[PDB]
RNA sequence: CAUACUUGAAACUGUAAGGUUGGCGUAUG
């Protein structure tokens, strides 16, 4: 086999939030599956069987069986028109992508934001045939493949765009890196198997993390337990809920403890007044932080958790 | 703007960056 691209560290599959554009800027780069947060990385990919001068394009796609260009855009370090262009130095052939951020398209501008991307990819000859429409493969990145759409070819992308957005996952997308090697004049167009990494999973996805604590009267407490406090939920059911105190211990150990209450004691389903569970030892000398979080007896879902400061006698 | 069925905004702050607020739509009054 010749020259091809691999990816040496897929991006991390969850945890990481898409962002809109009325957000703001620079809320984080994606990390990489293995980033820590004392050793932190971020995708990478690599050029094989070849080393010298190499373009690499970064697009954003969908997680169906069929491949197709994702609504959404890839914005931060290096990233135009929502598509991350990085060159692969004449000696190392390892590329990183830090600082790259995912902006979420509103769902009113899915369908137009779709159509100008499918358009971009059409005139600048970036997989328009594997990502936009099968007869429109003739499009190659001819140091400009056709940088002059006819008339034909934006019907056939808004064909494509109209279908497409029937059934576009706005909180699932995967990267798909292509890599371009210069040709005969210089200019990168020699283009290589491209390649899709794991998806990306949006963290604040519709119903992703749906128990929650907004406050609560009293952070911290005695080991003893017994105290009461009031915590501010959203919507629970009185009949299906609990309050989980837990501390992830030195071995793959973890304690557990219940807010003590009962149905009654859930007002509206929006509060919750209950009793502090006794901690773990409470003989501590100095006190111990551990986390308190909702959690539903039905399907096991949790709330984040939050911190909780036990305290000794 | 309030229900109903639903689901997704608008922002702000400002980073070895993240966090907080939290949501489009159809229909009905």
Known sequence: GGPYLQILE????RGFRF????????????????SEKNKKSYPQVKICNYVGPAKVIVQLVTNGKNIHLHAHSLVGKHCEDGVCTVTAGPKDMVVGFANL?????????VFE?????????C???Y???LLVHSDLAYLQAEGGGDRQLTDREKEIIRQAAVQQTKEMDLSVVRLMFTAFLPDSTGSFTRRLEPVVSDAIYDS????????????????????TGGEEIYLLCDKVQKDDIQIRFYEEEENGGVWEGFGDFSPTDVHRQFAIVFKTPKYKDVNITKPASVFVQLRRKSDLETSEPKPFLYYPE
């Open 10 to 13: 897929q991006p991390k599959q």
């Open 19 to 34: 962002r809109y554009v009325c957000e703001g800027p620079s809320h984080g780069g994606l990390p990489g599956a293995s």
């Open 101 to 109: 951020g995912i902006l979420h398209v509103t769902k009113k501008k």
């Open 113 to 121: 934001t779709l159509e100008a991307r499918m358009t971009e990819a």
């Open 123 to 125: 005139i600048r000859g």
């Open 127 to 129: 997989n328009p045939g």
């Open 204 to 223: 604040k996805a519709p119903n992703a993390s749906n128990l929650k604590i907004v406050r609560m009267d009293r952070t911290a407490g005695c080991v």
